[PDB]
């Protein structure tokens, strides 16, 4: 029960059950990572959903 919230593989909060990598979101002085957990993931083309420990690399 774990992901990379911080760029470090941590225990989420808000009862987290599956990490997202969203890469949508093109915002500069970052290179399109917006890795978070969340309850209820929405498993899409730009932001895909897991259910495993340490899934968002």
Same mark, same amino acid.
């Given at each position: 029960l774990k992901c990379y919230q911080h760029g470090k !593989? !941590?225990?989420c909060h808000r009862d987290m059950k599956f990490?997202?990598?969203n890469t949508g979101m093109p915002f500069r002085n =970052?290179? =399109?990572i917006l890795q978070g957990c969340s309850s209820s993931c929405s498993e899409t083309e730009n932001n895909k959903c897991c259910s495993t420990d340490r899934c968002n690399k």
């Open positions: !593989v !941590v225990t990490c997202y990598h =970052l290179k =399109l």
